[PDB]
Amino acid sequence: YMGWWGHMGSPPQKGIAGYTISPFAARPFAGVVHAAIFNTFRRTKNQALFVILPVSFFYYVWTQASEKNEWLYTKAGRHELAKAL
Amino acid sequence: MTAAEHGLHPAEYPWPQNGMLSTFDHASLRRGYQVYKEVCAACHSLDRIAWRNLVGVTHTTDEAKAFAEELEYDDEPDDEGNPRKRPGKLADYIPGPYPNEQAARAANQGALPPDLSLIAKARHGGADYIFALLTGYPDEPPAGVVLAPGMNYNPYFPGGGIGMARTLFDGVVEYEDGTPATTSQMAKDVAAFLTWAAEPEHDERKKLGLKAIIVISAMLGLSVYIKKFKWSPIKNRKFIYNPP
Amino acid sequence: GKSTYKIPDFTPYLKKDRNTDANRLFSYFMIGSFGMLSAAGAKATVQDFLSNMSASADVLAMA
Amino acid sequence: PDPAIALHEAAAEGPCHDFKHHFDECVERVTKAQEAEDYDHAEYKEDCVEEFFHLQHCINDNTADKLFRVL
Amino acid sequence: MALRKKNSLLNMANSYVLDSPQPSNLNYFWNFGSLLALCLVIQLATGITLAMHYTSHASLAFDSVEHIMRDVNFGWFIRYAHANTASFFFICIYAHMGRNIYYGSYKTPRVLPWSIGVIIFLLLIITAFMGYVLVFGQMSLWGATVICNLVSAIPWLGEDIVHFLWGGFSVGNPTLQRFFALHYLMPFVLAVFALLHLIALHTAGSSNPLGITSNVDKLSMHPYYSFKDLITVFAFLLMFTLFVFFSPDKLGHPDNYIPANPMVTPASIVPEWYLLPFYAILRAIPDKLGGVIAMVAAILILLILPIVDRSIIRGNAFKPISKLLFGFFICNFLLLGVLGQVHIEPPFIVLGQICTIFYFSYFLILLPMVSTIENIFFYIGSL
Amino acid sequence: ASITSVVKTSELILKSPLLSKIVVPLAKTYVKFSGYRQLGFKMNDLIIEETPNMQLALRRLPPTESYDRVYRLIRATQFSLSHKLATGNDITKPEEDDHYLIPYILDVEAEAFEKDALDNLEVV
Amino acid sequence: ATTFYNVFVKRNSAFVATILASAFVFDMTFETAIDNFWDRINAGKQWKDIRHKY
Ligand code: HEC
Ligand code: HEM
Ligand code: HEM
Ligand SMILES: CCCCCC[C@H]1C(=O)O[C@H](C)[C@H](NC(=O)c2cccc(NC=O)c2O)C(=O)O[C@@H](C)[C@@H]1OC(=O)CC(C)C
Ligand SMILES: CCCCCCCCCCCCO[C@@H]1O[C@H](CO)[C@@H](O[C@H]2O[C@H](CO)[C@@H](O)[C@H](O)[C@H]2O)[C@H](O)[C@H]1O
Ligand SMILES: CCCCCCCCCCCCO[C@@H]1O[C@H](CO)[C@@H](O[C@H]2O[C@H](CO)[C@@H](O)[C@H](O)[C@H]2O)[C@H](O)[C@H]1O
Fold first, then answer.
1. What sections of the sequence does the record tag as coiled-coil (chain A) (predicted)?
2. Which atom of ligand 5 is nearest to the CA of B208?
3. Are A1 and F52 within 8 A, CB to CB?
């Protein structure tokens, strides 16, 4: 499924013209400030839920479990610990 | 587990060596050596430290040679193959108070005082644990605590009952630099000294780290420039399509 | 859009002084600095690391 | 004398007063309970370790920095 | 013809590091492969150097490690580098495997590099397990004891196999000397399998974040990906620097600075952090043999991803529901890791069982269901 | 899963009034959040192509469809590497998201599946 | 800029020679600079600071 240069396995290409300029002719950091702020904000906003939802759920579950475990091993939690074991 | 079973967590004290760019205070190290020598060394060994280790850290070559030369170490047998002793040298290790574990336990109601060369790394808390433990013997155990025979209450120790009694009291040591030898001062000095004993590369390691951080950061910045420079023809590519 | 002789717009990226020696020299200064730090970092690394093979402190103590 | 003694006393009477009182009340209860007969044949013998830890933890938070500043 | 193409030896190197045609749109998650190569090179360099100063005999092992720390010039650095890079090796390998699962790198035509990859991961685990025993501190000894006693669960022959592994009736000198020899060997085996999985990959080439063919638009490996890999090499070295020089013991267990003592049992025997999720899975099953099988199955089940993923599209970039499921799967795997080092106490016991069920149900139920439904949604949604 | 399976199951759903009433709106929102149209792709551009069946179906595409698909892949690859989204005419409109490939692959698979069945025929 | 390019950059042999010479100078000067800085931020704490008493 992959060939090599000259016969890479692409369907025939035709009709596309590609253009570019030398690295010495270009500003490598052109538009860096706009990208760093606006592009990153757009990219982050669109992915935020896929991180927030699972992280917040599993952090909540952990927090509840760790707090219960702590409470069960106090004096106040003696009776509930006895039942839990 | 109960909090008692874990032991109380020690406070975070502001040690001189805390801090990415901070060394130990060598004057505190020297004073801590003196506390080890006059208090702890009755029960605890420091087997991984040789006299040469103190030189240029806490003591001069001559002071350390003087400490070594006061002791006797086993020499090679004489010409009839009989045992002999020699005076100590800088290469020798600091000798421990007991010949073996059995002797150590017999002197300490069954408990075995650990070697202290690695103790700062071998316990959660490090210097803070050592300082907290030495200064954290309450006059009276919390009401309801039943100590096993030969145990002392100390909340920092897991379970609360430790075989080591309180040993630091105001003025048990007379510091050679005139510092007032309070319980707190001696615990701070000895904790610093034992931290040094566990990690004697500390000062050098952190200075080399500073050099590494600076060089690597600069190289990271330049590698970003060079990557972006080389990639700009790809990133800037434009297309015009005319469907055949 | 259709003519392939009309070059797409590269004005947002093009430097005016792209053919000058100063322009090239700057980029070679960055490449050079990076090579320089890499050489200094390699030398430090090699020296410190290989020194493990030289007599250790306990060997020098018995000399 | 040991600077810690004064700093610890000040912290107990001041910012850690609630915890000081809890520990005190606990001690009173436990000692009284030990005084009463058939304590040795009880199922549950209360201690004051928990209250002690809450107090000590509080004192340490209010003192650690101050103590090392005067050493 | 250029020499790099004409000469057969040069041409093999050329094919992998220079002319190798890569997709033009690989993101920074394609940098973990070369970071893993860097970890391997550091472990070989530091490990062979430690082997020049280490003594594998149980009477001297722990002390030889203290001699390295205290007397060998830069011994502290070489030891801390080796110990911390073992952790970084696992961070990079989990990132690399996470990328592969998210982007569908296990799908045809890349089943074979993925399957060899699963073996690489098993070899890494064994290598790191044996290396940790070599210190012969408390955790070294007790971790070896508990982990090797899992083999006792093998029916009929299990006990005999354990005594054979140990070379005696408990973990001792014979065990330590054999672990040294095998720890030295296993990284060479791992390097071979790493090379094999890249040769297998080279038939299809790298996948890319869009999941489509890159045969339409290729870029040479050098200079593009060479220079992109340098960025993360220096980012890695900065992380490495902060651990090795400023916090060299953060990732370790203090008990491993106590010499091994068969009498005294440490308060808690836990594996190194990178093994914790597998340990939680083992604990979840009450049966001894059950627990062992589940723990092995938790790794071997990666081999069925090419089958249970029913999607007609490679990778998750365009699959919102798959992305949510993947996020839950990852966070569950981290929670299993945390539960691997809590005490066996309520309510962590039941939590560990629910998380274990969720771990397996991702492969067996959820991914096949979600991938089936998304196929239908793509087709109906775009009609 | 085979394209055949996906197409047939979808057709079962589209037949059922109840099912279509609940599934078609979900499928349309799914496609909106999928966001492949914001890289100028058509849905069929995403189908895995590294199989014999798919390579055969791609060879059967009319040359114009084939050249346009090449361009859309190259254009999406350029948006991906730049971290940009399509704008204006590059965004695929819902009316442009045509199933140009589905008929070719359904014919390839129909033959492949018939061949498998007929390889297992038993003279009665 | 032309002159500088022509002498130090144009020939790779000269470029590499200049990079290595610069690395040598950097290495020596950086060592000295870090040493002085480290001594100032950790003043009074090191052995070299208390050695005179003994
Ligand atoms: C005369 C006896 C004695 C003296 C004096 C003594 N110790 Fe100990 N120490 C012990 C014994 C016994 C143990 C073991 C306690 C146990 O395990 O129950 C011990 C344990 C310790 C521990 C380990 C506690 C643990 O977590 O396992 C440290 C740290 C310690 N000592 C430090 C010191 C320092 C610092 C000094 C003095 C400056 C000191 N000791 C003085 C007898 C002593
Ligand atoms: C995949 C590569 C490797 C990994 C993941 C790895 C992992 C480990 C680990 C986790 C330890 C315990 C470190 C500690 O806490 O002190 C260790 C120790 C050791 N490793 Fe390796 N190792 C690798 C390669 C090698 C190689 C190639 C050698 C060559 C002999 C080696 C020699 C040693 C030695 C001698 C020790 C004991 C001394 C010490 O603890 O530092 N390792 N290794
Ligand atoms: C020593 C450990 C490893 C090394 C050095 C290594 C190295 C690499 C390299 C350099 C690549 C190509 C660049 C990249 O995609 O990152 C690669 C790709 C791949 N590796 Fe690994 N790898 C290792 C372990 C693994 C493991 C454990 C797995 C799977 C469980 C795996 C599966 C793959 C797959 C499927 C690919 C192709 C991914 C793609 O380009 O889409 N590898 N590996
Ligand atoms: C020296 C001749 C022997 C050929 C094998 C040498 C190494 C080799 O193939 O190099 C390449 C640089 C490779 N990277 C890639 O493929 C790559 C491809 C796409 C994108 C990126 N980066 C994106 O941003 C890549 O980095 C890589 O890191 O692989 C090592 C593991 C190989 O080492 C070995 O297997 C032997 C041992 C160290 C495991
Ligand atoms: C092909 C490569 C050529 C051969 C490689 C050479 C191998 C060994 C060369 C020198 C190794 C020892 O060289 C010696 O190294 C250590 C650091 O490593 C230096 O020591 C210097 O830095 C260290 C920490 O970095 C400090 O503890 C020390 O106080 C300071 O003097 C010595 O100044 C140098 O004399
Ligand atoms: C660091 C230890 C590793 C040492 C081994 C050194 C090389 C690494 C793998 C080489 C072994 C296989 O490498 C072998 O070489 C040939 C010829 O270059 C490669 O062939 C590849 O490039 C050639 C031309 O460059 C293409 O025509 C071909 O389509 C492509 O597959 C294959 O990938 C593989 O069959």
1. none
2. 25
3. no
Sequence-distant (6+) residues with CB within 8 A of E169 are E163
Best mutation site among A14, A16, A27 for testing chain C: the one with the most C CBs within 10 Å?
Answer: A27
Q: Pull the structure tokens for residue A77.
A: 């939690």
SS3 category, B162 = strand
Among candidates E107, E109, E313 on the partner chain, residue whose Cβ is nearest the Cβ of F46: E313
Whose CA is closest to atom 17 on ligand 3? E33
C-alpha closest to that of B29 among B214, B202, B223: B202
Q: Is the CB of E253 under 6 A from ligand 2?
A: no
If DSSP codes are grouped into helix, strand and coil, which group holds residue D52?
helix
User: E208: how many CB neighbours lie within 10 A of its CB?
Assistant: 25
Locate B89 and state its tokens.
């040298």
Token output for E137: 């501190």
The CA distance from G41 to the nearest CA of chain C, in Å, is: 24
Contact A21 C10 (CB under 8 A): yes
For this PDB entry, the determination method is: cryo-EM
**Contact state of B239 with F81 under an 8 Å Cβ cutoff:** no
**Do F83 and A11 lie within an 8 Å CB cutoff?**
no
Give the C-alpha separation, F68 to E36, whole Å. Answer: 39
Q: Residue E291 — φ and ψ, nearest 5°?
A: -65, -40
CA–CA gap between residue E280 and residue E277 (Å, rounded): 5
Please give the helix or strand (H or E) that residue E74 lies within, else none.
none
Greatest Cα-to-Cα distance within chain D, rounded to the nearest angstrom: 50
Catalytic residue among E220, E228, E255, E288: E228
Which residues contact residue B217 at a Cβ distance below 8 angstroms, ignoring those fewer than 6 apart?
A: E238
- Under 8 Å between Cβ of E58 and E44: no
| Chain B residues in contact with A27 (beta carbon < 8 A) | 232
| Sequence spans of domains, chain F | 1-124
E20 carries an active-site annotation: no
Q: How far apart are CA E378 and CA F7, in angstroms?
A: 11
- Give, in order, the Cα–Cα distances in Å from F16 to each of B172, E220, E370: 92, 52, 21
- Which of B88, B52, B81 has the alpha carbon at shortest distance from B200? B52
Give me B196's structure tokens.
């040094």
Pairing assessment for the beta strands B161-162 and B152-153 based on DSSP bridges: antiparallel
According to DSSP, the β-strands at B85-87 and B72-74 are antiparallel
Q: Which DSSP letter does residue E246 get?
A: I
Domain count, chain D: 1
E177's enclosing H/E stretch is: helix E173-201
Structure tokens that stand for E172 in this block: 């001792």
Q: Which of residues 161-200 of B touch C (CB under 8 A)?
A: none
What ranges do the domains of chain A cover? 1-85
Identify the domain containing residue D8 by its residue range: 1-71
CB C52 within 8 A of CB E75: yes
Neighbouring C-beta atoms of residue E60, cutoff 10 Å: 14
Looking at residue B147, what DSSP letter applies? P
Relative to the CA of E13, which ligand 6 atom is closest?
7
The question of whether E229 is a catalytic residue gets the answer yes
Q: Decide: helix, strand or coil at residue E115.
A: helix
The neighbouring-strand residues paired with A4 are A7
E245 within 8 A of E78, measured Cβ to Cβ: no
- Report the distance separating Cα E113 and Cα E119, nearest Å: 10
Judged by its nearest atom, the ligand closest to the C-alpha of residue B115 is: 1
Q: Inspect the structure and tell me whether chains G and D have 3 or more CB pairs less than 8 Å apart.
A: no
* G32 touches C51 (CB < 8 A): no
Dist CA B244 CA C13 (whole Å): 30
A16-19 vs B238-241, strand pairing mode: antiparallel
Task: Answer yes or no: are the C-beta atoms of E19 and E218 closer than 8 Å.
Answer: no
CB contact at 8 A, F85 and F38: yes
Name D33's Cβ contacts closer than 8 Å, sequence gap at least 6. D39, D45, D46
